Amino acid sequence: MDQREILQKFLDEAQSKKITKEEFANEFLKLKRQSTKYKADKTYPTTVAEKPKNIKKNRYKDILPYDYSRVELSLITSDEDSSYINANFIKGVYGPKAYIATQGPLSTTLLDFWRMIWEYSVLIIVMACMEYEMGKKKCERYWAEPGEMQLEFGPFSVSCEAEKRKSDYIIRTLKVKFNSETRTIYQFHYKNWPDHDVPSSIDPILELIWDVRCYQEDDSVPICIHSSAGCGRTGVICAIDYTWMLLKDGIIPENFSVFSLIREMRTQRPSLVQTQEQYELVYNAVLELFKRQM
């Protein structure tokens, strides 16, 4: 089957998956289980995060990065450091290390955050959450805003050059400086999460992703993605991108399945796509994207 053909087979099989009872529920139950079996078997050691010297750098005691795929930091900035961080490498359509799913930086890690973005020539960050959620803190401040001068993290110096206001999302242009160097960083801010149920409310996330890749089309450098735990909303923006990567380049598998795609990532980064309502957004979005490729 050529491209357009495999899309039909998909859309076609939508007037079924949609109606069927608890389709996603029972589905999303297989993932939840997956992690379970992968777990009771100790399939993926975590000791690095389990280390005492890192437990404080863990924002959630459950959301823990995997050794096998976590990001190692080497760009030293003092003996007051470590190699550890809370983030994992996530392979992309053509190669590994194409996504860096990381948590909301704590205060004790704004530095590591910048060592990471620097020791991996990161060019884009996508904040998928707000500073405050449920009358509770979620993400610490790592960026810089107009007329605010420049913030100093360890040896890093962040400053703001300009912002771009777009519907439910902003484009902050940063200027991080280190030992004489001055790279550019286009961080993205998304505050309005799509209404998994309402259709016309998922264009914003496509728009964001459409603008990010309208900045770094290729896959030369990793794209940092984070949310409150760098899971839920994080894996959603990775899966809607990865899938659009295939779309954008006539390479959608004949047996393409939002479920296996997600199942996979979750072997590189724990709890990716954390709830049913999210598992439905990925699909609906993928289903709104396919409809558009026609």
Binding site: R59, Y60, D62, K137, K138, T275
Partner: peptide, 9 residues
């Protein structure tokens, strides 16, 4: 924020 990210449904 150690209240465990996994506390929903």
């Amino acid at each position: 924020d150690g209240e465990e990210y996994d506390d929903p449904f």
